[PDB]
Amino acid sequence: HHHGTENLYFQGATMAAQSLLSIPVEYRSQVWCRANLPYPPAPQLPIPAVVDILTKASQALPQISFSWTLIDQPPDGSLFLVWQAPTLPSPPDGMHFMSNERFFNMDVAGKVLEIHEAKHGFYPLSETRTMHVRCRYRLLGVGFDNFWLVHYFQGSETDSIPANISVAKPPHLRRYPLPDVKTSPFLLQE
Ligand SMILES: [Cl-]
DSSP, X not given: OOOHHHHHHTXXXXXXXXXXXXXXXXXXXXXXXXXXXXXXXXXXXXXXXXXXXXXXXXXXXXXXXXEEEOXXXXXXXXXEEEEOXXXXXXXXXXXXXXXXXXXXXXEETTEEEEEEEEEEEEOTTTOSBXXXXXXXXXXXXXXXXXXXXXXXXXXXXXXXXXXXGGGSXXXXXXXXXXXXXXXXXXXXXX
């Protein structure tokens, strides 16, 4: 592949680039850059709570480390802070969806909150119906544009529909078992 868009995001991010180059080439497309916290698990969050969590993360960023790691079939409640370019695809998480991720925008205190909501989530190895929701959030205009809250939680009984990997997104099952890929921590601000 060529790396023009990636390279745009690793300008001036040397530590994160160095950590990625330590990973075998085949797995570099598979890893998430996730914060070493961990966030307590939570049910579906109100919008003001999301805004606060991302504001606090932006203010704490020089004291928070990240690692490149695989994420696979996280339990309901799982909350991650992740670094991702809005123009690159998300790495795999082991979740498939029977519908398209929908994109909503909310004005909050003169800022934009992006909500990317993927209902009808399922784990094809263990589920014949949809049981999960994934939300990716980010808050624009506060100097934290490339940082996301990613939330996995329980779907409603009313939203559960028959699931089949043959018509789901993504269409391809990931290779199991997963290799051991977790880098030692690095910083994204100094
Ligand atoms: Cl749809």
